[PDB]
Design an enzyme around this catalytic site. Structure first.
Site, PDB file in Angstrom:
ATOM      1  N   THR A  89       0.858  -1.186   0.000  1.00  0.00           N
ATOM      2  CA  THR A  89       0.000   0.000   0.000  1.00  0.00           C
ATOM      3  C   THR A  89       0.891   1.232   0.000  1.00  0.00           C
ATOM      4  O   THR A  89       1.891   1.295   0.725  1.00  0.00           O
ATOM      5  CB  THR A  89      -0.970  -0.003   1.228  1.00  0.00           C
ATOM      6  OG1 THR A  89      -0.217   0.090   2.433  1.00  0.00           O
ATOM      7  CG2 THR A  89      -1.660  -1.334   1.280  1.00  0.00           C
ATOM      8  N   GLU A 149      -5.801 -10.961   5.407  1.00  0.00           N
ATOM      9  CA  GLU A 149      -4.751 -11.732   6.073  1.00  0.00           C
ATOM     10  C   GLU A 149      -5.371 -12.998   6.626  1.00  0.00           C
ATOM     11  O   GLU A 149      -6.419 -12.929   7.286  1.00  0.00           O
ATOM     12  CB  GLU A 149      -4.128 -10.914   7.214  1.00  0.00           C
ATOM     13  CG  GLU A 149      -3.081 -11.676   8.010  1.00  0.00           C
ATOM     14  CD  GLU A 149      -2.228 -10.763   8.879  1.00  0.00           C
ATOM     15  OE1 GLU A 149      -2.711  -9.667   9.243  1.00  0.00           O
ATOM     16  OE2 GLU A 149      -1.079 -11.138   9.216  1.00  0.00           O
ATOM     17  N   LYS A 155      -8.593   1.730  -3.264  1.00  0.00           N
ATOM     18  CA  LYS A 155      -8.820   1.163  -1.949  1.00  0.00           C
ATOM     19  C   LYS A 155      -9.188   2.177  -0.894  1.00  0.00           C
ATOM     20  O   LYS A 155      -9.988   1.866   0.016  1.00  0.00           O
ATOM     21  CB  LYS A 155      -7.604   0.343  -1.491  1.00  0.00           C
ATOM     22  CG  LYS A 155      -7.449  -0.961  -2.239  1.00  0.00           C
ATOM     23  CD  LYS A 155      -6.388  -1.828  -1.526  1.00  0.00           C
ATOM     24  CE  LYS A 155      -6.981  -2.295  -0.184  1.00  0.00           C
ATOM     25  NZ  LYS A 155      -6.208  -3.400   0.404  1.00  0.00           N
ATOM     26  N   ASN A 161     -12.549   1.449   0.946  1.00  0.00           N
ATOM     27  CA  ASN A 161     -12.543   1.261   2.404  1.00  0.00           C
ATOM     28  C   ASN A 161     -13.290   2.379   3.128  1.00  0.00           C
ATOM     29  O   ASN A 161     -13.970   2.153   4.122  1.00  0.00           O
ATOM     30  CB  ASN A 161     -11.090   1.128   2.941  1.00  0.00           C
ATOM     31  CG  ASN A 161     -10.506  -0.241   2.624  1.00  0.00           C
ATOM     32  OD1 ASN A 161     -11.238  -1.098   2.217  1.00  0.00           O
ATOM     33  ND2 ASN A 161      -9.199  -0.441   2.809  1.00  0.00           N
ATOM     34  N   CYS A 171      -7.548  -1.302   9.168  1.00  0.00           N
ATOM     35  CA  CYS A 171      -7.601  -0.433   7.988  1.00  0.00           C
ATOM     36  C   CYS A 171      -8.602   0.715   7.956  1.00  0.00           C
ATOM     37  O   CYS A 171      -8.247   1.805   7.569  1.00  0.00           O
ATOM     38  CB  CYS A 171      -7.826  -1.288   6.730  1.00  0.00           C
ATOM     39  SG  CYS A 171      -6.424  -2.476   6.450  1.00  0.00           S
ATOM     40  N   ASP A 216      -7.478   4.443   6.959  1.00  0.00           N
ATOM     41  CA  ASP A 216      -7.784   4.853   5.588  1.00  0.00           C
ATOM     42  C   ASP A 216      -8.765   6.043   5.511  1.00  0.00           C
ATOM     43  O   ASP A 216      -8.630   6.913   4.641  1.00  0.00           O
ATOM     44  CB  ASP A 216      -8.331   3.665   4.764  1.00  0.00           C
ATOM     45  CG  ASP A 216      -7.213   2.671   4.356  1.00  0.00           C
ATOM     46  OD1 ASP A 216      -6.055   2.881   4.762  1.00  0.00           O
ATOM     47  OD2 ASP A 216      -7.478   1.687   3.630  1.00  0.00           O
TER      48      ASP A 216
END
Lengths: 379, 379
Positions: free
Chosen positions: B122, B149, B201, B205, B257, B261
């Site tokens: 990222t 993950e 993303k 997100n 995240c 984000d």
């Protein structure tokens, strides 16, 4: 025995009529309207509103359906009375006019106190619990309508879902009537308590406005950063948790329901801490400012609008700078729109307009695309 | 001939390894890592990370895959080098650390200037266009990773979509390598320009955080108005334009995240008028205040937390009133968490805790449900 029931519809606009035709396929339905002329066309099997399936069903199917201007005739012996009379919410005063619904409730309570009323008209959150307590009655239930004007019967024959705002046997019996007449099978059906049912459409409609406002802010960013908005939006919407519709950039969310419903919900949040609900209303104002500022930076002497509701807020901001707006919209039979001149000739329109704005790109505009500003991507 | 290509992976965390195993099914793959111990386990077909499919593929399939700590061996003759080294964004300083990625770009540009680098780590919006111009090179392309993950290889074998941030033949050739190794067929594939790919993303997100924040505000309203939140949410989500997931009320969106984000995107909006982007960040703070205020109104002397990341912000607000928090979380091997005491005995936990808070309801809590506060509906 539901098979032998009588259902009365009070209000013959698209919601009332859609429900009436749907149910008359299998049951006795009587539609009450105050306007004798509409009762006559209905009794002659002519639909008073524009809706393909409703006109087709009234003229070609054997519906046990009739109309009357007579209240006693309409309500007596009714097992259910569906209320679908006009109502209106005014954001500026936070006033929700429910007088037609209360008048019907009055009449039914007097003429047939055993009938079970199903309100389909849009009413304020808390309305049903309140009117039941005020009048000391119990036969009133709210059920939201999710119909699109123009495809109202189609939407009742293929509903997204059915929500009845009462958890009881008589609510389940009424949901069965709606599914029996539907073409779609397996319709999701939800029974809730009263006030919860009345809040569903505000939250649903406000979420749609939120989604439009979000993709519009993504678009504001793309324009200001010199990026391809479609590349970003398509990449984002390929995430299946987000999906790919209701994501077309525009000059702001508009239409007859989102602007009002977002504000109505915000008013209901008066004493509830929030940031998103309030931001959904503010976001639209900010987006229109951005759009107007982008058009004005081009220094137009005249701005042309190609086809005609958020674009109205753009017109307002442009005219505030003394810049005239000319409109090309054949569907409009008026001489003017908000004081601006409607131009019938399309080739003069392109000549005078220094910048042409539109919520959709078009074939004929190709020759002047250099001065056309639209943020549309998927229309 | 793609059939005879060599692909090198630089960085062996879940993203690097997932891509390496996926591709090694049909091509020569060499994984470069700085830690000799991880190269050894990889060469012995033992996965250094927890991931069922990666361990299964490395031990049971014939992958043309090997590892090395040697840069020259890893990069020479590589047609593509996938960069998946660690990077980190810090919201407080708005600092994005991309040093591992720049070091790799340096090494590959020196050792094999003809290799085409694909960054999967990222990076900040604009990073690739900037580094290409700074170094005077052209062989660097960004491609977002959408892997979870723990299911990283599973997600590359069944991807939502593939996005390559370059519109060219060599980008199409690399997308083909990703689809050739996948189990899913017909994977949606999108080619965009560089900066647009790097923004996907963040916008995706942030939209998910927005959706969670919206349903959380709907929940705040329901609690404060004495309404059944589940009845409203289910009724709203039966609208197929809205859908029914990512709509479970909580103490705030959390995880590794979304909080970062949303803030990263807000920082990118520094000079772009907006209301929603900023409100998504503020909304989470407001929700945690609401949740904490609701718990504190109960006047607890001790608040117990049943299982353990937004709940951390709730702990913070409670401890600010001098109220201790005790935690029940077997997975935690620590003696404390943010200074609060972990209690191993579950029955003492229920006795001391005046209010038990949790992001999920549970079987064992039934006996003390009267003092359990969770807004979870679908977990």
């Amino acid at each position: 025995g539901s098979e032998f029931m009588k259902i009365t519809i009070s209000g013959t606009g698209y919601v009332g009529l859609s429900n009436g035709v749907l149910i008359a396929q299998n049951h006795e339905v009587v539609a009450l309207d105050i306007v004798q002329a509409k009762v006559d066309m209905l009794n002659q099997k002519i639909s008073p509103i524009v809706d393909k399936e409703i006109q087709e069903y009234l003229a070609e199917k054997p519906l046990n359906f009739r109309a009357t201007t007579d209240k006693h005739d309409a309500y007596r012996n009714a097992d259910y009375v569906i209320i679908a009379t006009p109502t209106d919410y005014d954001p500026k005063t936070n006033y929700f006019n429910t007088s037609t619904v209360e008048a019907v409730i009055r009449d039914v309570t007097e003429i047939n106190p055993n009938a079970v009323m199903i309100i389909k008209s849009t009413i304020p959150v808390g309305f049903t619990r309140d009117i039941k307590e005020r009048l000391g009655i119990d036969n009133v239930i709210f059920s939201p309508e999710f119909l699109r004007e123009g495809r109202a019967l189609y939407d009742n024959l293929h509903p997204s879902r059915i929500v009845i705002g009462e958890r009881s046997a008589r609510a389940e019996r009424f949901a069965d009537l709606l599914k029996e007449g539907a073409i779609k099978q397996d319709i999701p059906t939800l029974f809730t308590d009263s006030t919860e049912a009345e809040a569903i459409k505000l939250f649903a409609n406000t979420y749609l406005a939120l989604r439009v406002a979000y993709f519009n802010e993504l678009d504001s960013y793309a324009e200001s950063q010199g990026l391809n908005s479609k590349q970003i939006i398509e990449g984002v919407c390929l995430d299946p948790r987000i999906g790919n519709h209701y994501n077309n950039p525009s000059f702001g969310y508009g239409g007859y329901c989102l602007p009002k419903d977002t504000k109505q919900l915000l008013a209901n949040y008066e004493s509830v801490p929030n940031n998103i609900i309030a931001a959904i209303v503010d976001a639209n104002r900010t987006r229109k400012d951005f759009i107007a500022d982008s058009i004005l930076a081009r220094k137009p002497k005249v701005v042309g609008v190609y086809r005609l509701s958020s674009i109205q807020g753009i017109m307002k901001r442009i005219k505030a700078k003394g810049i005239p707006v000319i409109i090309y919209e054949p569907v409009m039979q008026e001489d003017e729109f908000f004081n601006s001149r409607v131009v019938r000739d399309l080739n003069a329109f392109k000549q005078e307009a220094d910048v042409i704005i539109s919520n959709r790109m078009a074939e004929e505009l190709a020759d002047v695309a250099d001065k056309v500003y639209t943020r549309d991507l998927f229309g």
